[PDB]
Design a protein around this ligand. Structure first.
Ligand SMILES: [Mg+2]
Ligand SMILES: [Mg+2]
Ligand SMILES: [Mg+2]
Ligand SMILES: [Mg+2]
Ligand SMILES: [Mg+2]
Ligand SMILES: [Mg+2]
Ligand SMILES: [Mg+2]
Ligand SMILES: [Mg+2]
Ligand SMILES: [Mg+2]
Ligand SMILES: [Mg+2]
Ligand SMILES: [Mg+2]
Ligand SMILES: [Mg+2]
Ligand SMILES: [Mg+2]
Ligand SMILES: [Mg+2]
Ligand SMILES: [Mg+2]
Ligand SMILES: [Mg+2]
Ligand SMILES: [Mg+2]
Ligand SMILES: [Mg+2]
Ligand SMILES: [Mg+2]
Ligand SMILES: [Mg+2]
Ligand SMILES: [Mg+2]
Ligand SMILES: [Mg+2]
Ligand SMILES: [Mg+2]
Ligand SMILES: [Mg+2]
Ligand SMILES: [Mg+2]
Ligand SMILES: [Mg+2]
Ligand SMILES: [Mg+2]
Ligand SMILES: [Mg+2]
Ligand SMILES: [Mg+2]
Ligand SMILES: [Mg+2]
Ligand SMILES: [Mg+2]
Ligand SMILES: [Mg+2]
Ligand SMILES: [Mg+2]
Ligand SMILES: [Mg+2]
Ligand SMILES: [Mg+2]
Ligand SMILES: [Mg+2]
Ligand SMILES: [Mg+2]
Ligand SMILES: [Mg+2]
Ligand SMILES: [Mg+2]
Ligand SMILES: [Mg+2]
Ligand SMILES: [Mg+2]
Ligand SMILES: [Mg+2]
Ligand SMILES: [Mg+2]
Ligand SMILES: [Mg+2]
Ligand SMILES: [Mg+2]
Ligand SMILES: [Mg+2]
Ligand SMILES: [Mg+2]
Ligand SMILES: [Mg+2]
Ligand SMILES: [Mg+2]
Ligand SMILES: [Mg+2]
Ligand SMILES: [Mg+2]
Ligand SMILES: [Mg+2]
Ligand SMILES: [Mg+2]
Ligand SMILES: [Mg+2]
Ligand SMILES: [Mg+2]
Ligand SMILES: [Mg+2]
Ligand SMILES: [Mg+2]
Ligand SMILES: [Mg+2]
Ligand SMILES: [Mg+2]
Ligand SMILES: [Mg+2]
Ligand SMILES: [Mg+2]
Ligand SMILES: [Mg+2]
Ligand SMILES: [Mg+2]
Ligand SMILES: [Mg+2]
Ligand SMILES: [Mg+2]
Ligand SMILES: [Mg+2]
Ligand SMILES: [Mg+2]
Ligand SMILES: [Mg+2]
Ligand SMILES: [Mg+2]
Ligand SMILES: [Mg+2]
Ligand SMILES: [Mg+2]
Ligand SMILES: [Mg+2]
Ligand SMILES: [Mg+2]
Ligand SMILES: [Mg+2]
Ligand SMILES: [Mg+2]
Ligand SMILES: [Mg+2]
Ligand SMILES: [Mg+2]
Ligand SMILES: [Mg+2]
Ligand SMILES: [Mg+2]
Ligand SMILES: [Mg+2]
Ligand SMILES: [Mg+2]
Ligand SMILES: [Mg+2]
Ligand SMILES: [Mg+2]
Ligand SMILES: [Mg+2]
Ligand SMILES: [Mg+2]
Ligand SMILES: [Mg+2]
Ligand SMILES: [Mg+2]
Ligand SMILES: [Mg+2]
Ligand SMILES: [Mg+2]
Ligand SMILES: [Mg+2]
Ligand SMILES: [Mg+2]
Ligand SMILES: [Mg+2]
Ligand SMILES: [Mg+2]
Ligand SMILES: [Mg+2]
Ligand SMILES: [Mg+2]
Ligand SMILES: [Mg+2]
Ligand SMILES: [Mg+2]
Ligand SMILES: [Mg+2]
Ligand SMILES: [Mg+2]
Ligand SMILES: [Mg+2]
Ligand SMILES: [Mg+2]
Ligand SMILES: [Mg+2]
Ligand SMILES: [Mg+2]
Ligand SMILES: [Mg+2]
Ligand SMILES: [Mg+2]
Ligand SMILES: [Mg+2]
Ligand SMILES: [Mg+2]
Ligand SMILES: [Mg+2]
Ligand SMILES: [Mg+2]
Ligand SMILES: [Mg+2]
Ligand SMILES: [Mg+2]
Ligand SMILES: [Mg+2]
Ligand SMILES: [Mg+2]
Ligand SMILES: [Mg+2]
Ligand SMILES: [Mg+2]
Ligand SMILES: [Mg+2]
Ligand SMILES: [Mg+2]
Ligand SMILES: [Mg+2]
Ligand SMILES: [Mg+2]
Ligand SMILES: [Mg+2]
Ligand SMILES: [Mg+2]
Ligand SMILES: [Mg+2]
Ligand SMILES: [Mg+2]
Ligand SMILES: [Mg+2]
Ligand SMILES: [Mg+2]
Ligand SMILES: [Mg+2]
Ligand SMILES: [Mg+2]
Ligand SMILES: [Mg+2]
Ligand SMILES: [Mg+2]
Ligand SMILES: [Mg+2]
Ligand SMILES: [Mg+2]
Ligand SMILES: [Mg+2]
Ligand SMILES: [Mg+2]
Ligand SMILES: [Mg+2]
Ligand SMILES: [Mg+2]
Ligand SMILES: [Mg+2]
Ligand SMILES: [Mg+2]
Ligand SMILES: [Mg+2]
Ligand SMILES: [Mg+2]
Ligand SMILES: [Mg+2]
Ligand SMILES: [Mg+2]
Ligand SMILES: [Mg+2]
Ligand SMILES: [Mg+2]
Ligand SMILES: [Mg+2]
Ligand SMILES: [Mg+2]
Ligand SMILES: [Mg+2]
Ligand SMILES: [Mg+2]
Ligand SMILES: [Mg+2]
Ligand SMILES: [Mg+2]
Ligand SMILES: [Mg+2]
Ligand SMILES: [Mg+2]
Ligand SMILES: [Mg+2]
Ligand SMILES: [Mg+2]
Ligand SMILES: [Mg+2]
Ligand SMILES: [Mg+2]
Ligand SMILES: [Mg+2]
Ligand SMILES: [Mg+2]
Ligand SMILES: [Mg+2]
Ligand SMILES: [Mg+2]
Ligand SMILES: [Mg+2]
Ligand SMILES: [Mg+2]
Ligand SMILES: [Mg+2]
Ligand SMILES: [Mg+2]
Ligand SMILES: [Mg+2]
Ligand SMILES: [Mg+2]
Ligand SMILES: [Mg+2]
Ligand SMILES: [Mg+2]
Ligand SMILES: [Mg+2]
Ligand SMILES: [Mg+2]
Ligand SMILES: [Mg+2]
Ligand SMILES: [Mg+2]
Ligand SMILES: [Mg+2]
Ligand SMILES: [Mg+2]
Ligand SMILES: [Mg+2]
Ligand SMILES: [Mg+2]
Ligand SMILES: [Mg+2]
Ligand SMILES: [Mg+2]
Ligand SMILES: [Mg+2]
Ligand SMILES: [Mg+2]
Ligand SMILES: [Mg+2]
Ligand SMILES: [Mg+2]
Ligand SMILES: [Mg+2]
Ligand SMILES: [Mg+2]
Ligand SMILES: [Mg+2]
Ligand SMILES: [Mg+2]
Ligand SMILES: [Mg+2]
Ligand SMILES: [Mg+2]
Ligand SMILES: [Mg+2]
Ligand SMILES: [Mg+2]
Ligand SMILES: [Mg+2]
Ligand SMILES: [Mg+2]
Ligand SMILES: [Mg+2]
Ligand SMILES: [Mg+2]
Ligand SMILES: [Mg+2]
Ligand SMILES: [Mg+2]
Ligand SMILES: [Mg+2]
Ligand SMILES: [Mg+2]
Ligand SMILES: [Mg+2]
Ligand SMILES: [Mg+2]
Ligand SMILES: [Mg+2]
Ligand SMILES: [Mg+2]
Ligand SMILES: [Mg+2]
Ligand SMILES: [Mg+2]
Ligand SMILES: [Mg+2]
Ligand SMILES: [Mg+2]
Ligand SMILES: [Mg+2]
Ligand SMILES: [Mg+2]
Ligand SMILES: [Mg+2]
Ligand SMILES: [Mg+2]
Ligand SMILES: [Mg+2]
Ligand SMILES: [Mg+2]
Ligand SMILES: [Mg+2]
Ligand SMILES: [Mg+2]
Ligand SMILES: [Mg+2]
Ligand SMILES: [Mg+2]
Ligand SMILES: [Mg+2]
Ligand SMILES: [Mg+2]
Ligand SMILES: [Mg+2]
Ligand SMILES: [Mg+2]
Ligand SMILES: [Mg+2]
Ligand SMILES: [Mg+2]
Ligand SMILES: [Mg+2]
Ligand SMILES: [Mg+2]
Ligand SMILES: [Mg+2]
Ligand SMILES: [Mg+2]
Ligand SMILES: [Mg+2]
Ligand SMILES: [Mg+2]
Ligand SMILES: [Mg+2]
Ligand SMILES: [Mg+2]
Ligand SMILES: [Mg+2]
Ligand SMILES: [Mg+2]
Ligand SMILES: [Mg+2]
Ligand SMILES: [Mg+2]
Ligand SMILES: [Mg+2]
Ligand SMILES: [Mg+2]
Ligand SMILES: [Mg+2]
Ligand SMILES: [Mg+2]
Ligand SMILES: [Mg+2]
Ligand SMILES: [Mg+2]
Ligand SMILES: [Mg+2]
Ligand SMILES: [Mg+2]
Lengths: 47, 272
RNA sequence: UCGAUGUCGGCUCGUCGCAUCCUGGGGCUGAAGAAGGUCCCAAGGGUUGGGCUGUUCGCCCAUUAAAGCGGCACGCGAGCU
RNA sequence: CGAAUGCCGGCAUGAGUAACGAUAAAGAGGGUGAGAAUCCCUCUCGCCGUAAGCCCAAGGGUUCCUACGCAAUGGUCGUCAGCGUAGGGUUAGGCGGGACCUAAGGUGAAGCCGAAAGGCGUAGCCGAAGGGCAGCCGGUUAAUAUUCCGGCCCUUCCCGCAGGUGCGAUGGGGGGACGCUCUAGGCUAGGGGGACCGGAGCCAUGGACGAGCCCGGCCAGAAGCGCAGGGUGGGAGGUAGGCAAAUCCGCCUCCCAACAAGCUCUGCGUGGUGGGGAAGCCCGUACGGGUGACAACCCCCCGAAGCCAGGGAGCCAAGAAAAGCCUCUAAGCACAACCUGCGGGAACCCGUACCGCAAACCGACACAGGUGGGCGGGUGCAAGAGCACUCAGGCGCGCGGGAGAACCCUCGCCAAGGAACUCUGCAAGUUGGCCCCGUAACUUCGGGAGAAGGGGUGCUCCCUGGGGUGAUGAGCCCCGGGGAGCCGCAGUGAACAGGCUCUGGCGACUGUUUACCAAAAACACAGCUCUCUGCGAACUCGUAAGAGGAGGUAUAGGGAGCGACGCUUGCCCGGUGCCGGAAGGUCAAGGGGAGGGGUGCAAGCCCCGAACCGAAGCCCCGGUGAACGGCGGCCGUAACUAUAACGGUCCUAAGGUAGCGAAAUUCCUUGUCGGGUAAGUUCCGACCUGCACGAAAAGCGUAACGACCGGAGCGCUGUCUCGGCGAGGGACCCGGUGAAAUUGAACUGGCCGUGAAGAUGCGGCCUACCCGUGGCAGGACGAAAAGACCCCGUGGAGCUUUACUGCAGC
RNA sequence: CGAGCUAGCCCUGGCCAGGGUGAAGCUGGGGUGAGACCCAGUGGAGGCCCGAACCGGUGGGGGAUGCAAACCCCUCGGAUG
RNA sequence: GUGGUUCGUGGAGCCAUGGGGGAAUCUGGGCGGACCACCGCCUAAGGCUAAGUACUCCGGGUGACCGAUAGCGCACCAGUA
RNA sequence: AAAAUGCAAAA
RNA sequence: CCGAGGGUAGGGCCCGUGACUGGGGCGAAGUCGUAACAAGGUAGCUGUACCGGAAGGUGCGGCUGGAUC
RNA sequence: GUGGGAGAGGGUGGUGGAAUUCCCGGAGUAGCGGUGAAAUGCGCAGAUACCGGGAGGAACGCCGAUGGCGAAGGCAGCCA
């Protein structure tokens, strides 16, 4: 069965990456929230 | 004109293809071409604003000359008559004696090797462009500007023309391809003759796929929708329109007249 | 019984009732004989194969000693369809 | 706290129960070790082989190599491991990416728009699996190699000399540069063969010292050269176009080769040289190494979908950009600079282990599922990437041992019968490839067709045709033809491998669909009709700017229905809808103010306020049917009945034409009649009483098509009469590991009663030692899911409209 | 916050063994006043035929605390659009 | 035409303003709840201004606050696995 | 240039 | 080897027969109308097309086998 | 053969004027149409009758005949 998670790395940073969150006031607040909660990662992994 | 086929498959039996003998050489294209951005029906938001579009063969845009007056008085030889995938007509390559090369939409009867020219001078002959005021009343004519120096906007489609029905002051009266009687300004360039490739209306696509190549995706009747979707959606089996027939947006699609009323160009129209 | 008692028909497996279809035993006869009619006793066993239809039922073909009628959640879906 | 299908946690029950994840498959010897079916090595056996082998890309992130380890992970075991600890291991001017280019799209000085957040946007910039760009063969490590080493071969940048030239760009021009189908000539890869060359060694078990058998017989390589191809005209004159300028490019006229002739660029070959190099035998291992050798290193044949490559031809749906590169000139500068040759120096960053059709990626798992490109050998079958077996290489699917019950699953066979089975031939079977003979209605002349239905098929010998390569030959390949004969039940001897025919319904056809219960007669479709839209089009998206439409222009575009094709599509415009109408009626704000009012001494301030003029809309008047839609009733009447061509009359906007009709529509209904069958609620043909067909929500047909639905026949069958036997995987037994829903507590029997109306649990009676195992499903109103049906709730939500009330839009 | 599933479109690439049928055109011969046209060869079209890969998911059986929260077997549809 | 206020169009003034019209400078102008008169109040169409007030990331003090299923989600390398 | 239908069977 | 014939399959022609259906002939006095023969009361006929209970009507073209005071 | 002739014989392209219709304008009223007589219809929203402008299609008056041409069907403004 083809499942729902088909990891590609560029997509991931292209989509949820740091620079992508900071473009959009929606996302800049995401970062704000995430930071205030004290997340160890404000943005998914990397690479 | 209009090549037909023996039914060696179904849908080849009804299929009918244009006649390309009228095409001089040049299968390929003068680098007066330019890439076409295909929309898919979608506008600058990511949105379908015209339904059922896309797929269909790649196309290269032939840039064509809809102002003939920038070149007044410079004649040109008609070098090629070729296929323009972007319009119903065929285009003419013409080599100006200027040395400049340009595309013209190809009038009916204009032949390769012809002398072509545009300006108030001009012979009245196929291919020549003049202002309207200098064209003899009752000559058919095509590629017509609606306003002076804004480019040819009327009678461009295969086999269309317009005819000069008379003059009044600064303006001249045309019968347009629609049958509408319109005042066009005297100063507007037109180019004498009629567009030609007129067997065009007689082609027959013949299979579904052929409609696809032309970039036209399947068209589905509101009748077959549900009511979320269309005014004609619903009702157990089949069912009639059940209301005066409508568009998806709900406005009336049989007879209901949509031209703006208070439009300014009303003063320059006389007809249907 | 709705914090669930799966519904017709079929197939499978039966079991029981008798208001008995057959076979056994009888009385009356408008019973000569053979063959019937009708009532009485009798639940031991038996009670066919097909065409049509989802059908139950029913009609029909070919037979039969007979081709019985009911109950068992209109028996039986933690047995099947 | 005792209950909330409460919440968290712990431990029970089912239970030593199901299962332990593909039925490709195992056996033994030896080794190690506390311990061995499970680790190592050997022999035997089995399984993949267009893979279950090998190489790239994603993705994963140390899983890699090695030493030490076995608590947990591993469905058992474990001495093993993708596991624990530690140590190693990834080497590039040339491979990929970046100090290159542009695609969609993104972003975006300029500019436009938006209450704010923000939305657009030309240039530009970013963006690649596309364009551009210079490395091939070996060897080496336990673990990297186009990366190190070895040989041969290139690239750019910088400095320098020599020679050449108006040098010079982000600007002009050329080029880059393009489809699909079919392809020619020559090569290469790859493969088969060789009586030739090289080679350890073998003669078994009856035979063979043999032109025996077994093994191998190449790889890379600049200049030069050869063969095959790609690209390309040369000179002058004029010049007003290519947004400045060009000597370039375009255009016109001359003249000369039309030919690769040349010039040029690729491919292949050959090349100085470098390097590889089998079986077998012996060691030497978790596998690698030595000899074989001074290895040989050649001829023939088949041959790409790959190369020459911008090759050719046909066709219509008409097939990226930009840079690199060449060229032209501009400022500038011509001590510059650029081109060519040579020489020295300079050349950065990131990736590089390993898995990669999977036990390392996506699927909670060492999951029978999903995952893009390349290579993918041999023989035989017509071909083939099919199928069977098989090299190379890789595997035996991380529980085993037995036993030989019911039952289940997957398989094999069957006397006679042959669809009786059953909603239905569901399922299985039959058929099956190739070559030849043959082949109907009907048809749109293509089809229908593989219609149907037949015959052939192996092997041996003889004679003989033509082709390819060679040479006009031999050998090697390739198609064939003819005669004679041998064997079996059988020659597509195994494997891959249509059952056929008749006949209705629906849909013209190929397509499309409810991912995961519907693939259809639904949707699409070519095509027909209506309608809107003159172009800043209509229409859609957006508050807007903007965009799509469309770089289109009525032969176009948008909306609606109908749905190839054939023959056709009748009557009603009263109502609704749209369309047309300068009058008239009505009508809002506004205009206008007769005339009235509050209040002030008053000048006045301030209020009402009738006429009248006043838009759309509505009203009114027409039109309109491929616009919404609609297309009658009662009574009489013909030689006997019978029926009613005919008449009467009421109503209507007008009363259903053609054609179909018990129908995907017919209630009564299994209508009646015919056909088929021994028998036919279905089926086919009829009739017409059409409950309740009927003409673009089209009517009636139509060849061809269909995993659609109906009916009939032939063929053939374990579907059946009606079962039997056999096979394997389970079920059972032993050793290892060991779940699950469920569960008020249980010391949990039958009948007849009773009871909230269906009792193991109450009464009466009967029957009944205690405890399990394998089996069957009648009951515990068995499990599961707080019934989906039904109602209730002034509970939700999707949908509709001439429900109300708004809003956008117009 | 989501189109790394799925739906459509846009840009750029890749894939489709083998076999079958044999349209137009062209060429030649017949035919004619010239034509239509007929035959033969060539030719190689097609939402054409059979069938792998690939894409499906027709019918049945199995599975049903599964190998699997859609799977396995046999069968079947398309396979140059 | 709207908003604000207790004011939901009401007799609806005040305060703010999107549209239209559009003055005056102390004998000017705004207000006292439609309007008028009279008596009063106030000076629009520029700007600034501590303090008293709100809060608790942080530090301290204190509790008829909790005591590891409580108390913060976290007493423990938790916004972690 | 015209209102207007019909006429039992046999002889 | 050929071979009467038998068997399996697929065509062709002909004859009979079939629910029902199409018209045709004929049949002493049936029903409806008046189309034609006298400008037959619309001159008729006619090929074709449409329509209509029926004869027929109407369109287009044609013929005189019709028509002048 | 050569020289002459008549003709609506055919094919193609153009072109003229009369009239009908519709639309625009102008003036202009109470009716027009139509028949056997009428009605339906058209007209105060300005019809008919009148003038001017324009569009478009078809057919070609007088010549013209009982004539011509063609094999028949058939062929008639004018020009090449
Ligand atoms: Mg998941
Ligand atoms: Mg990526
Ligand atoms: Mg966007
Ligand atoms: Mg379309
Ligand atoms: Mg459609
Ligand atoms: Mg629907
Ligand atoms: Mg929607
Ligand atoms: Mg709606
Ligand atoms: Mg509807
Ligand atoms: Mg529905
Ligand atoms: Mg319906
Ligand atoms: Mg419907
Ligand atoms: Mg229009
Ligand atoms: Mg209950
Ligand atoms: Mg209930
Ligand atoms: Mg319960
Ligand atoms: Mg239950
Ligand atoms: Mg009795
Ligand atoms: Mg008896
Ligand atoms: Mg007796
Ligand atoms: Mg007596
Ligand atoms: Mg007796
Ligand atoms: Mg007697
Ligand atoms: Mg008995
Ligand atoms: Mg009994
Ligand atoms: Mg039968
Ligand atoms: Mg049946
Ligand atoms: Mg019945
Ligand atoms: Mg019976
Ligand atoms: Mg019974
Ligand atoms: Mg029951
Ligand atoms: Mg069941
Ligand atoms: Mg049942
Ligand atoms: Mg409790
Ligand atoms: Mg309690
Ligand atoms: Mg529960
Ligand atoms: Mg419970
Ligand atoms: Mg055990
Ligand atoms: Mg048990
Ligand atoms: Mg058990
Ligand atoms: Mg077990
Ligand atoms: Mg296993
Ligand atoms: Mg196993
Ligand atoms: Mg041992
Ligand atoms: Mg062993
Ligand atoms: Mg094992
Ligand atoms: Mg192989
Ligand atoms: Mg490997
Ligand atoms: Mg990676
Ligand atoms: Mg992982
Ligand atoms: Mg490695
Ligand atoms: Mg390892
Ligand atoms: Mg070890
Ligand atoms: Mg362990
Ligand atoms: Mg273990
Ligand atoms: Mg496991
Ligand atoms: Mg390790
Ligand atoms: Mg180097
Ligand atoms: Mg640099
Ligand atoms: Mg870049
Ligand atoms: Mg760039
Ligand atoms: Mg932007
Ligand atoms: Mg800006
Ligand atoms: Mg842009
Ligand atoms: Mg790239
Ligand atoms: Mg590249
Ligand atoms: Mg590179
Ligand atoms: Mg390695
Ligand atoms: Mg190497
Ligand atoms: Mg090196
Ligand atoms: Mg100079
Ligand atoms: Mg230069
Ligand atoms: Mg340059
Ligand atoms: Mg340069
Ligand atoms: Mg350029
Ligand atoms: Mg260019
Ligand atoms: Mg080409
Ligand atoms: Mg080679
Ligand atoms: Mg070779
Ligand atoms: Mg060899
Ligand atoms: Mg050899
Ligand atoms: Mg030798
Ligand atoms: Mg030797
Ligand atoms: Mg021997
Ligand atoms: Mg070489
Ligand atoms: Mg030249
Ligand atoms: Mg010059
Ligand atoms: Mg020149
Ligand atoms: Mg210039
Ligand atoms: Mg060379
Ligand atoms: Mg050597
Ligand atoms: Mg080319
Ligand atoms: Mg080419
Ligand atoms: Mg650039
Ligand atoms: Mg200068
Ligand atoms: Mg130079
Ligand atoms: Mg150098
Ligand atoms: Mg590496
Ligand atoms: Mg590697
Ligand atoms: Mg690997
Ligand atoms: Mg796989
Ligand atoms: Mg692969
Ligand atoms: Mg692996
Ligand atoms: Mg592997
Ligand atoms: Mg692995
Ligand atoms: Mg993992
Ligand atoms: Mg495993
Ligand atoms: Mg797996
Ligand atoms: Mg996994
Ligand atoms: Mg795959
Ligand atoms: Mg191969
Ligand atoms: Mg092979
Ligand atoms: Mg072979
Ligand atoms: Mg053989
Ligand atoms: Mg084969
Ligand atoms: Mg291959
Ligand atoms: Mg295979
Ligand atoms: Mg091996
Ligand atoms: Mg046997
Ligand atoms: Mg049998
Ligand atoms: Mg038998
Ligand atoms: Mg039989
Ligand atoms: Mg039966
Ligand atoms: Mg039966
Ligand atoms: Mg059937
Ligand atoms: Mg079957
Ligand atoms: Mg089969
Ligand atoms: Mg037949
Ligand atoms: Mg055929
Ligand atoms: Mg057929
Ligand atoms: Mg056959
Ligand atoms: Mg057939
Ligand atoms: Mg033989
Ligand atoms: Mg043999
Ligand atoms: Mg034989
Ligand atoms: Mg076989
Ligand atoms: Mg087959
Ligand atoms: Mg029919
Ligand atoms: Mg279909
Ligand atoms: Mg049809
Ligand atoms: Mg559908
Ligand atoms: Mg489905
Ligand atoms: Mg689902
Ligand atoms: Mg669903
Ligand atoms: Mg299907
Ligand atoms: Mg809007
Ligand atoms: Mg706009
Ligand atoms: Mg636009
Ligand atoms: Mg555009
Ligand atoms: Mg349209
Ligand atoms: Mg339809
Ligand atoms: Mg109506
Ligand atoms: Mg009306
Ligand atoms: Mg109406
Ligand atoms: Mg109106
Ligand atoms: Mg009015
Ligand atoms: Mg007023
Ligand atoms: Mg007023
Ligand atoms: Mg007063
Ligand atoms: Mg009005
Ligand atoms: Mg009306
Ligand atoms: Mg109709
Ligand atoms: Mg109605
Ligand atoms: Mg009536
Ligand atoms: Mg009555
Ligand atoms: Mg009828
Ligand atoms: Mg009929
Ligand atoms: Mg009927
Ligand atoms: Mg009906
Ligand atoms: Mg019968
Ligand atoms: Mg019958
Ligand atoms: Mg029937
Ligand atoms: Mg219907
Ligand atoms: Mg209907
Ligand atoms: Mg209807
Ligand atoms: Mg209709
Ligand atoms: Mg239909
Ligand atoms: Mg039909
Ligand atoms: Mg299909
Ligand atoms: Mg189907
Ligand atoms: Mg059986
Ligand atoms: Mg058995
Ligand atoms: Mg067994
Ligand atoms: Mg007990
Ligand atoms: Mg009881
Ligand atoms: Mg008790
Ligand atoms: Mg008791
Ligand atoms: Mg038990
Ligand atoms: Mg039970
Ligand atoms: Mg039960
Ligand atoms: Mg409930
Ligand atoms: Mg209520
Ligand atoms: Mg409610
Ligand atoms: Mg996607
Ligand atoms: Mg592509
Ligand atoms: Mg092929
Ligand atoms: Mg041919
Ligand atoms: Mg096909
Ligand atoms: Mg097919
Ligand atoms: Mg097939
Ligand atoms: Mg296969
Ligand atoms: Mg492949
Ligand atoms: Mg896929
Ligand atoms: Mg699908
Ligand atoms: Mg399936
Ligand atoms: Mg399905
Ligand atoms: Mg099943
Ligand atoms: Mg199933
Ligand atoms: Mg198949
Ligand atoms: Mg298939
Ligand atoms: Mg196929
Ligand atoms: Mg395509
Ligand atoms: Mg106000
Ligand atoms: Mg308020
Ligand atoms: Mg207020
Ligand atoms: Mg109120
Ligand atoms: Mg107020
Ligand atoms: Mg204001
Ligand atoms: Mg102030
Ligand atoms: Mg303060
Ligand atoms: Mg507080
Ligand atoms: Mg504090
Ligand atoms: Mg304490
Ligand atoms: Mg605790
Ligand atoms: Mg806690
Ligand atoms: Mg404690
Ligand atoms: Mg806290
Ligand atoms: Mg907590
Ligand atoms: Mg912590
Ligand atoms: Mg009469
Ligand atoms: Mg014979
Ligand atoms: Mg015979
Ligand atoms: Mg008859
Ligand atoms: Mg008459
Ligand atoms: Mg008469
Ligand atoms: Mg008459
Ligand atoms: Mg009539
Ligand atoms: Mg006439
Ligand atoms: Mg005549
Ligand atoms: Mg008036
Ligand atoms: Mg007038």
């Amino acid at each position: 069965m083809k499942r729902t998670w088909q990891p590609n790395r560029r997509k991931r940073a292209k989509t949820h990456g740091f620079r992508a969150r900071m473009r959009t006031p929606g996302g800049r607040k995401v970062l704000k929230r995430r930071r205030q909660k004290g997340r160890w990662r404000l943005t998914p992994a990397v690479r | 004109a209009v090549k037909k086929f023996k039914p060696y498959t179904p849908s080849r039996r009804f299929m009918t293809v244009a006649d390309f003998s009228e095409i001089t050489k040049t299968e390929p294209e003068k680098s007066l071409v330019k890439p076409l951005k295909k929309t898919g029906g979608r506008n600058n938001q990511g949105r379908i604003t015209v339904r059922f579009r896309g797929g269909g063969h790649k196309r290269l845009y032939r840039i064509i000359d809809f102002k003939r007056w920038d070149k007044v008085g410079i004649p040109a030889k008609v070098a090629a008559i070729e296929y323009d995938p972007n319009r119903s007509a065929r285009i003419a390559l013409l080599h100006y004696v200027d040395g400049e090369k340009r595309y013209i939409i190809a009038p009916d009867g204009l032949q390769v090797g012809q002398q072509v020219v545009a300006g108030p001078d001009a012979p009245i002959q196929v291919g020549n462009a003049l202002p309207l005021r200098f064209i003899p009343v009752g000559t058919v004519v095509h590629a017509v500007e609606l306003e002076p120096k804004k480019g040819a906007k009327l009678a461009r489609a295969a086999g269309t023309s317009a005819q000069i029905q008379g003059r009044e002051g600064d303006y001249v009266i045309l019968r347009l391809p629609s049958g509408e009687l319109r005042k066009v300004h005297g100063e507007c360039y037109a180019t004498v003759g009629a567009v030609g490739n007129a067997d065009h209306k007689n082609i027959v696509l013949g299979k579904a796929g052929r409609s696809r190549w032309l970039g036209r995706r399947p068209h589905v009747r509101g009748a077959a929708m549900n009511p979320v979707d269309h005014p004609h959606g619903g009702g157990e089996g089949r069912a009639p329109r059940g209301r005066p027939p409508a568009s998806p947006w709900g406005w009336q699609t049989k007879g209901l007249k949509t031209r703006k009323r208070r439009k300014p160009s009303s003063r320059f129209i006389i007809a249907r």
